[PDB]
Write a protein that binds this ligand. Structure first.
Ligand SMILES: Nc1nc2c(ncn2[C@@H]2O[C@H](COP(=O)(O)O)[C@@H](O)[C@H]2O)c(=O)[nH]1
Length: 170
């Protein structure tokens, strides 16, 4: 069954969260859309991007390279829709700002606005990990910006517990 999400807490009308590996979730859920926490050249070197691409045996990277050759790099805050290969029907590759490289944190709102083009998404938090944004801030921007249905997979149990306790005790 498509979009078979289970095990999430519902934080808002739009936003759900689970302590999960987004690759394992995408295999179970069969989402119409999985979000990649991409960079502007769609180089899936590690993090969520690397994990999603690894699950596609590099098909995602080859398709991404072709997209970039034909269309040029994305903008920070931008997105493109490509195949979800064996994980999803579509992968929405979204570029959040890398505040470790001095990109404007205000583009995290632009980045999450891309989600609103899809009714239902499985997604990571944006601009976490090596992109350097505070995940609590990222979740706040997500809930303030996304208006459809987003199922967030947070891999790290400690981070998950911190996000949930922070959000629900606000
Ligand atoms: N493209 C990309 N590379 C990442 C991401 N997170 C980590 N990396 C890279 O992936 C490699 C392994 O990182 P680790 O798995 O230890 O976090 C390192 O080269 C690191 O810079 C990410 O979200 N995107």
């Amino acid at each position: 069954m498509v979009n078979s999400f289970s095990g999430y807490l519902k934080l808002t009308d739009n936003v759900y969260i689970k302590n999960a590996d987004i690759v394992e979730e995408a295999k179970k859920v069969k989402p119409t859309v999985v979000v990649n926490a991409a960079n502007v050249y769609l180089k899936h070197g590690g993090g969520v991007a690397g994990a999603l691409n690894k699950a596609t045996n590099n098909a995602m990277q080859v398709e991404s390279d072709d997209y970039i050759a034909t269309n040029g790099p994305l903008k920070v805050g931008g997105s493109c829709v490509l195949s979800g290969h064996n994980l999803a029907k579509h992968c929405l590759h979204v570029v959040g700002p890398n505040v470790n490289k001095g990109e404007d944190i205000q583009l995290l709102k632009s980045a999450y606005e891309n989600f609103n083009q899809h009714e239902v998404l499985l997604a990571p938090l944006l601009s976490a990990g090596i992109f350097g944004a505070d995940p609590i801030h990222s979740l706040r921007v997500c809930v303030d910006t996304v208006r459809t249905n987003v199922y967030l997979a947070v891999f790290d149990k400690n981070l998950y517990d911190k996000l949930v306790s922070s959000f629900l005790e606000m």
